[PDB]
Amino acid sequence: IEADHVGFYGTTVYQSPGDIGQYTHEFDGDELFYVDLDKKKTVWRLPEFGQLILFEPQGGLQNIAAEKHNLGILTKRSNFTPATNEAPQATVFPKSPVLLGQPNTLICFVDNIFPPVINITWLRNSKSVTDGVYETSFLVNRDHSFHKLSYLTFIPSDDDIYDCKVEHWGLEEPVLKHWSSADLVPR
Amino acid sequence: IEADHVGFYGTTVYQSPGDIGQYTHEFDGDELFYVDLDKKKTVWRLPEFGQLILFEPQGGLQNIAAEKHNLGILTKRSNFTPATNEAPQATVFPKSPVLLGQPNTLICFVDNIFPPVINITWLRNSKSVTDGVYETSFLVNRDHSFHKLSYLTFIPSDDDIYDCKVEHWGLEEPVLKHWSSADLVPR
Amino acid sequence: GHATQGVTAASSHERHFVVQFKGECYYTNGTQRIRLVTRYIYNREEYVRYDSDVGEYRAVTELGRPDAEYWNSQPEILERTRAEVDTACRHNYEGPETSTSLRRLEQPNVAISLSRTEALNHHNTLVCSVTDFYPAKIKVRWFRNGQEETVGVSSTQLIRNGDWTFQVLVMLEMTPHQGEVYTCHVEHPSLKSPITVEWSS
C-alpha cells in the first residue's frame, strides 16, 4: 500500500527437510539484522545500529518455533504439496565507477530465489576466490520469492575475469555471470 | 505586441519653442546611440558597438527635419493645443551592493517626463557634485512620456548625504530624492 | 534492556516444504498513519492475514480458513495481534528507526563519463554516476554552459547496493562543442550544498 516507510518486523522462514529456519528485520527494503539461531546472537548489518538499539534473540527463536510448528500443520493440510523450484536471475555490478587500480566491490544480485536454498560463489580467472566475501540473508520479495546479495572486494584490473557462480535446484547447471574490467563478453 | 525582441529604429522628437530635437535608437528597452545634431556625430552608449556597426547621422538629421515640418503643420491642425506638463517620479539606487569604501555608482531613474525638458543634478552633503556624472538621452515610454537615467560615481561613506535634484515645469519646487549609506531618512 | 520489538507469529491448532511469516508495518506522514499487515505463507501461497483496516484475521486462500476462524476465536491472540500496531510499529518507528534508519545520511559521489562509446557521428552520452548515497531521495540536473538541459536527460532506475546505499546513472543526450561546459548538479539531504562536477574537452 501507499506508505512513506515500511518496516519488516518479525519476518520468519522455515523449511522442513533439514529444519532450516531464518529470522530477520528490514527497514525500507534494507536488511537490519538477522539472528544466529546457532550462537543465539542478534547480528546487525550496520553494526553501528546495534550499538544504539537492541533485539532480544529469544524473540526470533520464539518465532522460529511458531513457524516450525505451523509448517508441520500446513504440510498435512495441503496434502503434502511441496515447493516449486524457480529459476533465479543473477546480475553483477560494481558499487562504484570501476577505475583501474582503485579498490572497489563487485556485487552479485540474485533474484527469484525459491526455495530459499542457494549457493553463491565467486571465481577470478576461473578459480574460486574466497576473499573479503560477504553475503546478505535471504531478503524477502513481494511475490514470496527471495533475493540475495554477495560481495567481492577487488582492485580493478584488465587482466582478470570474474564470475558469480549461482547454484540452485531450479538450476540445471551452475549459472556463471561474467564481469571483466576490459568489457569481457563471456571469456 | 508579443515579441521576443523589439528594436526602436528611427525614434525622433521635436519641440517648437527653442527648436529642440532629438534622435536615437534602442534595442529591447536599452539606448543604442544618439546623434549629436550639433557635431553631427553618431554617439554610442556602448562604444564597443559603433566599432562593429555604423549609423549615418544624415539619417537622423533627415528625420529631425521631417518632425520639425510636421510639428508646424500639426500645431495648426490642433488649433494650437499645447503640451500638458506632467509630474516626474524619481528613484535613487546603487548599481551594486553598497559596501563601505568600495567604488560604486548611484543611479537616479526619473519617470513620467513630459514635456521632454528636464534638469537632473546631484548634491553631496548638500552641495553640487559635478563628478563622473553621466546622463542618458530621453528614453521613450509606451504612454508617450519619457524617462531618464543619471549616474554618479562614488565610494560609499556613512558621512555623506546624496540628493538627486529634479527640476521640471510640472515641478513646483525642485524635488530632492535622498540617499545615504547610513540609512538616511530625509536629512 | 529491550528496544527493538518483533511481531509475533501465531501458532495454529491440532519432499521440500517452506513457510514464511511476515510482519510488515507501513508508515505515512510520520507515526500519524500506521498500518499493520501480517501474512502466513505456505511455500509461496499466502493463506491467512491480519490487516489493520480490517480488524481481524481473514483467509486469503481456502487453507487459511481454519486459522482465521480459530485465531479470531481466541481473544488473546486477536488482542496480542491487534495491539502490535502500537507496541511494535509505533514503538519501533519512534524509538529505533528515528535514531537509526531515519537519521542515516550517505553523501553521494558523482563522476562524469563520455558514453555510447565512440567519437561523434552520434556521440552524445554523458553519464553521471551518483553512487553510495542514502536515503533514496535525490534530484540530478544537467547544465549546458550556464543553462539547464531538460530535453535529452535519461535516468537509469535506482539501484540498491544492499549495503544501505543507492546509486543511479543520469545521462544527457548530446553532440559536443568546444567551449562548452556540461555540469552534473546533485541535490540530496546528506549534502550541505548541492554538489557539482563538470565535463569539457
Add this chain to the structure above:
Amino acid sequence: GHATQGVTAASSHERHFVVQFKGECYYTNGTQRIRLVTRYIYNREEYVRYDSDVGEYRAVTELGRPDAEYWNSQPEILERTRAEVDTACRHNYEGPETSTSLRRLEQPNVAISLSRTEALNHHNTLVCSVTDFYPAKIKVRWFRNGQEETVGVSSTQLIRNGDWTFQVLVMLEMTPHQGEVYTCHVEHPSLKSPITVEWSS
C-alpha cells in the same frame, strides 16, 4: 559604408508643443516573424500609424485622418514605408543586432545579506543580490542545506540599470539554525556553470 539603418519619418502636406515619430520593430522566433509599427505623436497623442498586419496608414485619432489619406495616396511613401520591414527591421536584426545586442553577455555577481533587519523573532530574510547581468534571462534558486527551498522565495522586479545591465533581489523566508547552509544558485547564459554563494552563522 552604412550598416545600421533607421526608419524614415513621413512628412505631411500643405506655448510649448512637441511631436514624436516612432519607428518600432518587433521580432519573434528570430527573423521568422517581423512586424513594423510606426507612430506619429502630437504632444502625447498618437494620430497616424502604419501597422504591418494592416498594410497601410490608419488614423488612430481624428487628426491623423489627413495624413492617412494622403500618404496612402502617395504610392512612393506607401512603398518606402511598407518595405522598411526588410530594409530596416530584417536588415538590422540580421546584421547589427546579431553582432551587437544579441551577443552581449554580462556575468552576474551574487551576494547574500541578512535582512528584515534584526535578530530573530521574525528574522528570516536572506536577500541575494544578483547584479550587473545581461541579458534579462535568469533563474535563481535557494537551497537549505542540500535541498531546494520552494516555499518562502520572493523575487523583486527586474531592475534596469540603464547601462545595458540588470539586477534583481531574490529573498528567502526563514528562521535560521546552526548547522544550516543556505545557497543562492544562479543560472544565466553568460555563465559557464551556474554560480553559487552560501550563508551560515
